[PDB]
Amino acid sequence: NVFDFPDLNRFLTRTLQVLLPDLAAKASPAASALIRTLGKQLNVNRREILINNFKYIFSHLVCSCSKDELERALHYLKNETEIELGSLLRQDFQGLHNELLLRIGEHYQQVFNGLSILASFASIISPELMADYLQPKLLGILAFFNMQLLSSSVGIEDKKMALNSLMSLMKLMGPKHVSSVRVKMMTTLRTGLRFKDDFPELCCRAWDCFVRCLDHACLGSLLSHVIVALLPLIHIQPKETAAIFHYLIIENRDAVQDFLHEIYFLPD
């Protein structure tokens, strides 16, 4: 009522997406009773609601919890859902990894541990091994990030967090994975530009990564759209856009032999 949600059950619908993770983080018998109460109010079973919100549940768990408490809550949730937690996580093949890569910008190391537990159940802390275990999901993960940037349900602060997470993810992917996913990465960076009305330098750093950290050879087939998109960012502010353009032009000039002349649109 203080928030004036349309329906109290709609307020519960919105709030649960984050409350269920904290309810599991408490892992108390009172928490189980409260989950049953919510399922009654939402007219759903206490076992299925947990399996459904397990994405955000495990996400917040790996985001903030202790390993012993993590295992405690895992066993508690398995018993409450009446199914093996490993099987549920298997049923959550990509949705969980999505939220993990969304929370990486907040807790790099915590989500590194979570992905290590993501890979242990998927069958592991080496960064290259982690990237290779995540290299398959990339396109789908990029699509999830893009949809998150697109959704009106998430705030602009959540969008900035997702952008930072995407920056860290592009850093972790390495030049091979980045070069492989360049097209979808460029689509998602265009989405970031579409949202860059308020977080300009954030998207600018994202582009600095997608340019400098990106492959050095195959720059120009993509440098076309890179300049086309960065055109709006320069007008907002030129501080880092100038350095981005310099790295694109000056540094990779030899590998920008023809694509340089191909790009005749340039601001002042």
Side-chain angles (χ1 to χ4, degrees), residues 1-2 4 6-8 13 21-22 24-34 37 39-40 43 49 52-53 64 73 79 86-87 95 104-105 111 114 116 119-120 122-124 126-127 131-132 136 140 143 146 148 150-151 153-156 160 162 164 166-169 174-175 178 180-184 186-188 190-192 197-198 200 202 205-206 208 215 217-218 220-222 224-225 229 232 237-238 240 242-244 249-252 254-255 267-268:
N1 292 337
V2 289
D4 283 324
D7 290 322
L8 75 163
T13 308
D22 306 328
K26 191 53 65 56
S28 87
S32 298
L34 289 171
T37 312
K40 295 315 198 315
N43 281 348
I49 176 167
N52 293 316
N53 293 319
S64 314
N79 308 343
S87 46
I104 184 166
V111 308
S116 68
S120 77
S123 180
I124 320 295
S126 178
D132 309 348
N146 198 311
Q148 285 302 327
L150 283 174
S151 174
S153 45
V154 300
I156 63 175
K160 293 188 288 297
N164 286 295
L166 189 140
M167 283 180 58
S168 44
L169 182 48
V178 168
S180 297
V181 309
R182 57 171 78 100
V183 283
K184 185 59 188 54
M186 176 76 56
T187 64
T188 314
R190 185 171 293 104
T191 316
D197 49 280
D198 58 336
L202 184 46
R205 291 168 284 208
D208 171 75
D215 171 70
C218 169
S221 36
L222 273 301
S224 61
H225 301 87
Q237 76 264 20
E240 55 272 13
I244 288 189
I249 301 294
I250 302 298
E251 274 78 335
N252 210 41
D254 52 281
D268 307 330

